[PDB]
Design an enzyme around this catalytic site. Structure first.
Site, short mmCIF file in Angstrom:
data_model
loop_
_atom_site.label_atom_id
_atom_site.label_comp_id
_atom_site.label_asym_id
_atom_site.label_seq_id
_atom_site.Cartn_x
_atom_site.Cartn_y
_atom_site.Cartn_z
N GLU A 59 0.55 -1.52 0.01
CA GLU A 59 -0.41 -0.25 -0.39
C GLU A 59 0.48 1.56 -0.08
N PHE A 121 -12.43 -8.11 13.30
CA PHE A 121 -11.61 -8.45 12.05
C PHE A 121 -11.67 -7.14 11.18
N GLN A 122 -9.62 -7.12 11.20
CA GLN A 122 -9.11 -6.46 10.35
C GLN A 122 -10.03 -4.84 10.74
N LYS A 171 -17.76 -1.84 4.28
CA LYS A 171 -18.46 -2.83 3.61
C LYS A 171 -19.96 -3.57 2.88
N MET A 485 23.09 11.75 4.62
CA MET A 485 22.35 12.81 4.71
C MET A 485 22.41 12.59 6.54
C1 LIG Z 1 -7.17 -15.28 7.02
C2 LIG Z 1 -7.34 -15.16 8.75
C3 LIG Z 1 -8.43 -15.85 9.30
C4 LIG Z 1 -8.76 -16.34 10.62
N1 LIG Z 1 -9.27 -17.12 10.80
C5 LIG Z 1 -9.62 -17.83 12.45
C6 LIG Z 1 -10.32 -19.40 12.95
O1 LIG Z 1 -11.14 -19.36 11.79
N2 LIG Z 1 -10.26 -19.25 13.65
C7 LIG Z 1 -9.89 -18.40 15.05
O2 LIG Z 1 -9.83 -18.60 16.14
N3 LIG Z 1 -9.30 -17.45 14.83
C8 LIG Z 1 -8.67 -16.75 13.37
N4 LIG Z 1 -8.26 -15.70 13.20
C9 LIG Z 1 -7.78 -14.68 14.04
C10 LIG Z 1 -8.88 -13.74 14.76
O3 LIG Z 1 -9.11 -13.18 13.91
C11 LIG Z 1 -8.47 -13.50 16.26
O4 LIG Z 1 -7.60 -12.80 16.34
C12 LIG Z 1 -8.84 -14.74 17.32
O5 LIG Z 1 -9.82 -15.49 16.68
C13 LIG Z 1 -8.50 -14.39 18.26
O6 LIG Z 1 -8.45 -15.05 19.68
P1 LIG Z 1 -7.97 -15.27 20.77
O7 LIG Z 1 -9.45 -14.77 21.12
O8 LIG Z 1 -8.09 -15.86 21.30
O9 LIG Z 1 -6.28 -13.91 21.45
P2 LIG Z 1 -6.89 -12.15 22.10
O10 LIG Z 1 -7.69 -11.83 19.99
O11 LIG Z 1 -5.73 -12.30 21.96
O12 LIG Z 1 -8.06 -12.10 22.80
C14 LIG Z 1 -6.91 -12.97 24.42
C15 LIG Z 1 -8.31 -12.49 25.03
O13 LIG Z 1 -7.87 -13.23 26.34
C16 LIG Z 1 -7.50 -11.49 27.59
N5 LIG Z 1 -6.47 -12.55 28.57
C17 LIG Z 1 -4.98 -11.40 28.06
N6 LIG Z 1 -4.12 -11.90 29.42
C18 LIG Z 1 -5.20 -12.69 29.66
C19 LIG Z 1 -5.40 -13.40 31.50
N7 LIG Z 1 -3.66 -13.37 31.86
N8 LIG Z 1 -5.68 -13.57 32.47
C20 LIG Z 1 -7.07 -13.90 31.66
N9 LIG Z 1 -7.40 -13.16 30.20
C21 LIG Z 1 -6.15 -12.80 29.99
C22 LIG Z 1 -7.61 -10.41 26.80
O14 LIG Z 1 -8.02 -9.50 27.27
C23 LIG Z 1 -8.81 -11.49 25.97
O15 LIG Z 1 -10.00 -10.51 25.82
C24 LIG Z 1 -8.09 -15.73 11.57
C25 LIG Z 1 -7.47 -14.26 11.18
C26 LIG Z 1 -6.87 -13.93 9.69
C27 LIG Z 1 -5.63 -13.00 9.45
C1 LIG Z 2 16.87 16.35 3.53
C2 LIG Z 2 15.68 17.88 3.46
C3 LIG Z 2 16.71 19.09 3.75
C4 LIG Z 2 15.83 20.15 3.55
N1 LIG Z 2 16.52 21.07 2.50
C5 LIG Z 2 15.82 22.32 2.29
C6 LIG Z 2 16.78 23.50 1.76
O1 LIG Z 2 17.84 24.32 1.67
N2 LIG Z 2 16.05 24.75 1.04
C7 LIG Z 2 14.92 24.27 0.91
O2 LIG Z 2 13.49 24.99 0.21
N3 LIG Z 2 13.54 23.81 1.17
C8 LIG Z 2 14.32 22.45 2.07
N4 LIG Z 2 13.09 21.37 2.60
C9 LIG Z 2 12.04 20.76 1.65
C10 LIG Z 2 11.12 21.68 3.06
O3 LIG Z 2 11.11 21.02 4.04
C11 LIG Z 2 10.44 22.32 2.61
O4 LIG Z 2 9.10 21.47 1.94
C12 LIG Z 2 9.74 23.46 1.66
O5 LIG Z 2 10.61 24.89 2.10
C13 LIG Z 2 8.50 23.95 1.09
O6 LIG Z 2 8.64 25.18 0.13
P1 LIG Z 2 7.52 25.40 -0.56
O7 LIG Z 2 6.84 26.84 1.30
O8 LIG Z 2 7.72 26.87 -1.23
O9 LIG Z 2 6.40 24.65 -0.95
P2 LIG Z 2 4.97 24.29 0.26
O10 LIG Z 2 5.45 23.43 1.82
O11 LIG Z 2 4.22 22.73 -0.84
O12 LIG Z 2 4.06 25.19 0.28
C14 LIG Z 2 3.43 25.82 -0.20
C15 LIG Z 2 2.72 27.12 -0.05
O13 LIG Z 2 2.07 27.86 -1.09
C16 LIG Z 2 0.09 28.12 -0.84
N5 LIG Z 2 -0.67 27.87 -2.25
C17 LIG Z 2 -0.33 26.63 -2.84
N6 LIG Z 2 -1.16 26.85 -4.31
C18 LIG Z 2 -1.36 28.34 -3.84
C19 LIG Z 2 -1.69 28.85 -5.15
N7 LIG Z 2 -2.69 28.91 -5.96
N8 LIG Z 2 -1.59 30.31 -5.20
C20 LIG Z 2 -0.90 31.48 -3.61
N9 LIG Z 2 -0.39 30.46 -2.97
C21 LIG Z 2 -0.46 28.84 -2.82
C22 LIG Z 2 0.35 27.48 0.26
O14 LIG Z 2 -1.12 27.36 0.47
C23 LIG Z 2 1.87 26.96 1.31
O15 LIG Z 2 1.30 28.21 2.18
C24 LIG Z 2 14.07 20.11 2.40
C25 LIG Z 2 13.62 18.86 2.67
C26 LIG Z 2 14.60 17.60 2.98
C27 LIG Z 2 14.00 16.64 3.19
C1 LIG Z 3 -11.94 -6.82 6.62
C2 LIG Z 3 -13.72 -7.63 6.91
C3 LIG Z 3 -14.63 -6.62 5.83
C4 LIG Z 3 -13.85 -9.06 6.84
C5 LIG Z 3 -13.61 -10.14 6.04
N1 LIG Z 3 -15.21 -9.47 7.73
C6 LIG Z 3 -16.10 -9.57 7.48
C7 LIG Z 3 -17.18 -10.34 8.37
N2 LIG Z 3 -19.15 -9.69 8.40
C8 LIG Z 3 -19.55 -10.21 8.36
C9 LIG Z 3 -21.31 -9.72 8.58
C10 LIG Z 3 -22.66 -10.20 9.27
C11 LIG Z 3 -21.70 -11.15 10.25
C12 LIG Z 3 -21.09 -11.23 11.14
C13 LIG Z 3 -19.74 -11.23 9.97
C14 LIG Z 3 -18.32 -11.32 10.50
C15 LIG Z 3 -17.20 -11.11 10.02
C16 LIG Z 3 -15.70 -11.55 9.77
O1 LIG Z 3 -15.11 -12.67 10.09
O2 LIG Z 3 -15.02 -10.97 10.45
N3 LIG Z 3 -16.14 -10.05 6.09
C17 LIG Z 3 -15.52 -9.37 4.76
O3 LIG Z 3 -15.52 -9.14 4.31
#
Ligand SMILES: Cc1cc2nc3c(=O)[nH]c(=O)nc-3n(C[C@H](O)[C@H](O)[C@H](O)COP(=O)(O)OP(=O)(O)OC[C@H]3O[C@@H](n4cnc5c(N)ncnc54)[C@H](O)[C@@H]3O)c2cc1C
Ligand SMILES: Cc1cc2nc3c(=O)[nH]c(=O)nc-3n(C[C@H](O)[C@H](O)[C@H](O)COP(=O)(O)OP(=O)(O)OC[C@H]3O[C@@H](n4cnc5c(N)ncnc54)[C@H](O)[C@@H]3O)c2cc1C
Ligand SMILES: CC(C)[C@@]1(C)N=C(c2nc3ccccc3cc2C(=O)O)NC1=O
Ligand SMILES: Cc1ncc(C[n+]2csc(CCOP(=O)(O)OP(=O)(O)O)c2C)c(N)n1
Ligand SMILES: Cc1ncc(C[n+]2csc(CCOP(=O)(O)OP(=O)(O)O)c2C)c(N)n1
Ligand SMILES: Cc1ncc(C[n+]2csc(CCOP(=O)(O)OP(=O)(O)O)c2C)c(N)n1
Ligand SMILES: CC(C)[C@@]1(C)N=C(c2nc3ccccc3cc2C(=O)O)NC1=O
Ligand SMILES: CC(C)[C@@]1(C)N=C(c2nc3ccccc3cc2C(=O)O)NC1=O
Ligand SMILES: CC(C)[C@@]1(C)N=C(c2nc3ccccc3cc2C(=O)O)NC1=O
Ligand SMILES: CC(C)[C@@]1(C)N=C(c2nc3ccccc3cc2C(=O)O)NC1=O
Ligand SMILES: [Mg+2]
Ligand SMILES: [Mg+2]
Ligand SMILES: [Mg+2]
Lengths: 582, 582, 287
Positions: A59, A121-122, A171, A485
């Protein structure tokens, strides 16, 4: 008129309504990585033929490519991701896009409405997480709001001060069937009532007056003028005022011009900071007075009247209190002031030759320089050779670090949208992805990512995208085996004490690690290496002539230092011009 | 007594006070990636000899390695990053650690206090951004609070319900000199007054009573019992109650046992869900009734008395209203109930042989299965061969997707802390980094990352870390050229319509892309490929015997499907057991 | 002290709000749902399985009936002074326990709660969670509009009453038969009490009268009603207290009865904040 794929009265999935909302906004490209929460959306994307989806390998690459797409063109960047892990993976991109004011629209899929807060989840409170790092965000709660919210997001992202706008779409809403209303009005009463109005003549002529009264006028151009390339040019050819730009403003005014002072700031030219340090009139257009540009605010242009034109009121007066300010579009201001300077031309009779010479002295007394050692390749030279071979027509994307400052200093950009660099947040790993975004937005253009070995390995996985997408991305990797740098800030303030800045393998610190050639090899991307400054041209020429994507690993001595350099918070009298690690 | 590096009255930098605060907490390992905002901290780290710093190639790897470190051991994970881009790069890790309740402490460097809000360079409102995705966070505003805040972070991160705790430390505070007070008291009045007290006998015996009154008792163990391995075991050998665990609870009770029902849920065994679907008594210990485990809550254990023991009150009754609940440490509850079952043994005379047989029928009528086609390698088989060759003693880290469910189904974990998988957020790219964390936390142990081609390429850059850090990480890459879990949800609910799930190169869809072998090659990591099920053992044996890090790319047919599978929101009567894409 | 609360008993907690269940006291058995439904349900079971169960708690009831007689609600009477408790009891009597009571906050509030027997809910309207003073009079207005044909009586404190005294204008203009039984003790009772109990009876701005003439009742609450066309009266002698209250009740329309009481009175019993059943105070005042 937009030819829909559904009947005006035919109900379709919300997911379909979303995609159609994007098509109606002119969107032709998205960078979306699949997920449970966005599946419906992706399916809906395949039903569209006007929109191409470029699948990234992570991303973060998706969002950075969206930035590249945006920065390299006029259109906004559009990236899409699933919930939770997918969504949080965009966070860096948004902050980046918010700080550098970049048009961006992020669509994240969310868990069903009823499950929000149930800590499903997620699931992640994406809206809460991205509140302070986006221009504005939304949480769709009704399939009937999709049309309006999408139109409002694109509007906000591209109007006023451009910025990222995230739209969370549960969703279940994506599945809900409905009949979209593409005539709904936007609910932006507050925003619309804050949109600057065209500049007034009273304010514009007040500036022209200050120009004629000045003897040492200096233009301080920023990325706010990226759309005023012409107006800005006409202005200079009417006042003969020396132009200095921020890193963000590169390209606005051709760097290869006679009136060009090049980039000013922490790593700006000595003469650029000089001009500002001794100017009596600062024309700050499209700038935000960042720290790395002013240092000690009390010493910044302390001897000059500051005219600050900005589209964002909040920015005006924030860091440096102006004498005269104008809240509005800099392009309009420029066209206006141009007319006055055109009519009242003879009456004014502006002449700054004396000033220009005073500066032309410093420009020759302290020009940008770099040293060459034996046959080693000087990163600066490499860049210059690239500017040469590409005739300054190449779109450059960059990472962050030394290599970033050099790409900024030794390349002459002809126009804006040609320099794509992360400046406000300075996010590493920006480069490669950004180049992908640039290449899709500009098919018939030379796209070159000038990366650092640190910044490059961070998103190296996008090489897979480059290949699979058949993109002529050229990677000029300035390899110095370190975090330049950073290792630099050590030799300057920490007695050169290595703080985990070595990126090679301690087991054989003489070997280049990692072998960036093999990385490209894994992704079917032709590569080469250069170590001798002598065969550097053939090298770069090859990278340019070999059709398709290419990676040139050009080895450089790490000791190099980016100069000049004004320490953090310092002043013009703190400018460093000698030193390295030889 | 902690032997400091500074005199009890000797002033030192805040950065030094921080590091010393970590040493006093027993920290021996950190995962920190340099930056302007954290330089002072890094310098301070080099002054320490008790703490090793493992430099990752990307912050996300740093935070995920910190998770691995934490999950693979008892200590909490500690990761450090610079401001802005560095900091936002940890976001995914925190959400992950918060959802899976993982002890974690993140230290992010911030811009100087006075510049906060000024929207400075490389600045981000990290505290605001990470509010809803961490257990608690802090913004150090006084160098004199460093000792107390660090102690409070480690306390909160590791006590009660473990979680991530982020500490923002402005740069200027890191520089400020001072004399730390290591005797300050923690300011956690509210939290301390919410810490569950040891279980009462009245509540514990009420449970034992319900056990003797039950005919079909089923244990529903979760990751909340990861520290009650013994107590839980003793309990079973005293009640003879069949044990079914969540994905998070794997290992708590040896999967290779006779009383083991294995993992239950969306992808749990048919008999595990059966046992719960027909049990009259559900002993939910350390679980949070997630959706992918219950589906339709009204149909979950609808015919049974639910006893829910949890350390988090908020969790009790949240999704499924219990008959009997106990807010407290599950380990204490277990020891308690064990004594009662031990004394009142003869009096109770518990016998569930009838139940166990009713289940043992389903267990044999619907066992975990996988099909073998020609000479192709079945991912399940591969995993089984690994369990075999490692004698079930290997620490497994995983990505997310099909390969993730198989690693969960076809490997028998002997103890907890042996299975490290992202379950709550399900973040891809978790695997490799996590394995790094595991390997550092367990030097003399077999660490194997079972990744997917999608999840692996996402953080492939950590291979550089593996090499440079000399870590015997074994990567068993189940390569199916697709986004398995996603391409699966298509053949099941979207008529098998490919929604950008192909990870190979369309220009030659017959070639394996990317060539994961070359990736390891670039990082000096020996690799191999396996395609024939016949030479699969030699392959895996080699990966295991070759000293140092190793990568085995084991090709698999994508058509495979993870079964059984209960659709989202479905019930036990919706369990799918047949289907794929052949 | 939650650890001492029902420490010797199995707690069954039925609540419509899940968050509430287990929040402060961990139950043995809990039920998240409407208490009315739960009641109807459990009633059927107790009705059918009646004979089978044969519930008998006479032994328990007697054990309690002993304490109930050994420590009943009491109040002392001094000379001819009016005891606020007695006044309330006389009101319960004359209204036959059918009056809707609204209250302020303080001592007078606890007494209205202790010495009046409410027949049904919605009859007692008091601010308990936030305990906002000045609630009483306004609340009575709300009650009177919602229940036109009902006896509405605001039992206020001189402190709580003067706080929203302006609503008397509303009472008149709206023609609402609101009866104000003002228990006037010239102080901030509940507060002056917490002083004699934990601060050695040190007056912390709890006197509401005029220091220039601390013998005079200030303010003159009668004149307040007078300003708003609301008939009023005063009572000082416990002897003419019935006639007084009877008048307030019989006089059609709104009415205000200012019934003077000795401030020294204390609300008992009283378990200090955080204390336990073994900290229950039952003797003390400021005589
Ligand atoms: C692709 C994908 C698929 C998945 N499919 C599954 C699936 O099919 N089945 C599944 O199980 N999961 C699945 N998951 C994982 C799932 O999203 C949940 O993260 C998981 O089920 C959470 O399990 P948990 O509640 O046991 O753990 P946690 O979410 O870590 O929760 C732990 C819990 O324990 C409590 N607790 C912590 N420490 C203590 C302590 N010392 N004493 C008492 N309580 C404590 C917490 O406060 C909390 O409520 C999937 C995830 C992904 C990414
Ligand atoms: C390693 C490193 C070193 C750097 N060294 C330098 C350096 O030595 N010298 C330097 O200059 N910079 C340096 N920078 C970049 C610096 O951090 C600033 O991002 C930069 O100086 C900002 O310039 P700016 O104000 O012109 O642009 P911006 O920060 O983009 O600001 C633009 C401004 O213009 C205004 N404006 C936008 N559109 C319009 C429009 N249509 N009409 C009127 N106003 C508008 C905005 O709203 C804003 O106030 C460095 C960055 C890094 C990562
Ligand atoms: C990332 C999200 C949007 C994802 C994985 N999650 C669901 C989702 N949708 C649900 C919709 C209705 C009731 C229970 C659900 C449980 C889940 C789940 O598995 O966490 N659907 C999805 O597409
Ligand atoms: C994601 C992220 N991590 C850490 C930093 C801190 N940082 C600022 S400048 C810099 C320079 C090093 O990188 P490299 O790509 O090798 O290029 P060089 O400077 O050597 O040319 C670093 C690491 C950052 N800006 N972003
Ligand atoms: C960072 C991130 N992006 C997208 C998803 C959505 N997703 C959920 S399961 C899955 C499966 C695919 O990956 P792969 O590693 O190839 O393994 P397989 O399932 O094929 O074994 C995906 C992409 C996620 N969980 N995290
Ligand atoms: C608006 C407001 N201010 C202050 C308090 C603090 N307080 C709590 S009990 C109490 C008692 C005093 O009032 P009064 O109306 O004279 O009645 P008494 O207790 O004397 O009967 C006070 C002032 C409160 N609850 N509300
Ligand atoms: C050009 C104007 C409209 C500008 C600078 N002003 C806003 C703006 N508009 C707003 C409108 C309503 C409420 C709060 C706002 C905050 C901002 C802000 O500064 O972030 N957005 C913009 O782009
Ligand atoms: C990432 C931050 C913490 C970084 C690069 N930023 C400064 C910094 N520190 C400053 C301290 C005092 C006055 C002006 C400053 C300007 C900057 C700046 O360049 O933005 N110092 C640093 O180390
Ligand atoms: C074990 C207890 C102490 C547990 C579950 N309770 C808290 C907890 N403690 C808190 C203490 C004070 C204020 C708000 C809180 C919120 C939570 C919460 O549920 O996130 N943290 C925990 O780990
Ligand atoms: C307005 C508050 C501050 C007030 C009335 N509340 C307490 C108070 N303090 C307590 C202190 C420890 C344990 C239980 C308490 C319960 C209460 C309570 O009665 O709500 N103490 C006070 O002074
Ligand atoms: Mg480099
Ligand atoms: Mg795969
Ligand atoms: Mg009073």
């Amino acid at each position: 008129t937009f030819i829909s794929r559904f009947a005006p009265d035919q109900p379709r999935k919300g997911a379909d309504i979303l995609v159609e909302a994007l098509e109606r906004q002119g969107v032709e490209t998205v960078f979306a990585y699949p997920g449970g929460a966005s599946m419906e959306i992706h399916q809906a994307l395949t039903r569209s033929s006007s929109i191409r989806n470029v699948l990234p390998r992570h991303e973060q690459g998706g969002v950075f490519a969206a930035e590249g797409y945006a920065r390299s063109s006029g259109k906004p960047g559009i990236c899409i991701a699933t919930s939770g892990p997918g969504a949080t993976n965009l966070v860096s991109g948004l902050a980046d896009a918010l700080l550098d004011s970049v048009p961006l629209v992020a669509i994240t899929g969310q868990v069903p409405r009823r499950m929000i807060g149930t800590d499903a989840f997620q699931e992640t409170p994406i809206v809460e997480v991205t509140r302070s790092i986006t221009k504005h965000n939304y949480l769709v709660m009704d399939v009937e709001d999709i049309p309006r919210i999408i139109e409002e997001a694109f509007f906000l992202a591209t109007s006023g001060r451009p910025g990222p706008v995230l739209v969370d779409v549960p969703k279940d809403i994506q599945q809900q069937l409905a009949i979209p209303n593409w005539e709904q009005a936007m609910r932006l009463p507050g925003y619309m009532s804050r949109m600057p109005k065209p500049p007034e003549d009273s304010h514009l002529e007040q500036i022209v007056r200050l120009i004629s009264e000045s003897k040492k006028p200096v233009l301080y151009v920023g990325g706010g003028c990226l759309n005023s390339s012409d107006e800005l040019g006409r202005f200079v050819e009417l006042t003969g005022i020396p132009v200095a730009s921020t890193l963000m403003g590169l390209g606005s005014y051709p760097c290869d011009d006679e009136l060009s002072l090049h980039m000013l700031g922490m790593h700006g030219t000595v003469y650029a900071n000089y001009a500002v340090e001794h100017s009596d009139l600062l024309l700050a257009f499209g700038v935000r007075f960042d720290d790395r540009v002013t240092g000690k605010l009390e010493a910044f242009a302390s001897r000059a009247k500051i005219v600050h034109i900005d589209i964002d009121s909040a920015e005006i007066g924030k860091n440096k209190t102006p004498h005269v300010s104008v809240c509005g579009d800099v392009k309009l201001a420029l066209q206006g002031m141009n007319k006055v300077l055109e009519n009242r031309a003879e009456e004014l009779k502006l002449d700054f030759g004396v000033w220009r010479n005073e500066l032309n002295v410093q420009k020759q007394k302290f020009p940008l320089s770099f040293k060459t050692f034996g046959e080693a390749i000087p990163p600066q030279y490499a860049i210059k050779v690239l500017d040469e071979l590409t005739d300054g027509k190449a779109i450059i994307s960059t990472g962050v670090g030394q290599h970033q400052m050099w790409a900024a200093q030794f390349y002459n950009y002809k126009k804006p949208r040609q320099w794509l660099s992360s400046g406000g947040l300075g996010a590493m790993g920006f480069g490669l992805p950004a180049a992908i975004g640039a290449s899709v937005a500009n098919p018939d253009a030379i796209v070159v990512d000038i990366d650092g070995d640190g910044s490059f390995i961070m998103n190296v996985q996008e090489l897979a995208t480059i290949r699979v997408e058949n993109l002529p991305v050229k990677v000029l990797l300035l390899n110095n085996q370190h975090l330049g740098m950073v290792m630099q800030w050590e030799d300057r303030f920490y007695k050169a004490n290595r703080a985990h800045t070595f990126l090679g393998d301690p087991a054989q610190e003489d070997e280049i690690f990692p072998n960036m050639l093999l990385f490209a090899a894994a992704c079917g991307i032709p590569a080469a290496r250069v170590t001798k400054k002598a065969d550097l041209r053939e090298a770069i020429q090859t990278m340019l002539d070999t059709p398709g994507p290419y990676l040139l690993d050009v080895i450089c001595p790490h000791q190099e230092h980016v100069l000049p350099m004004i320490p953090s918070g310092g002043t013009f009298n703190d400018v460093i011009t000698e030193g390295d690690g030889r």
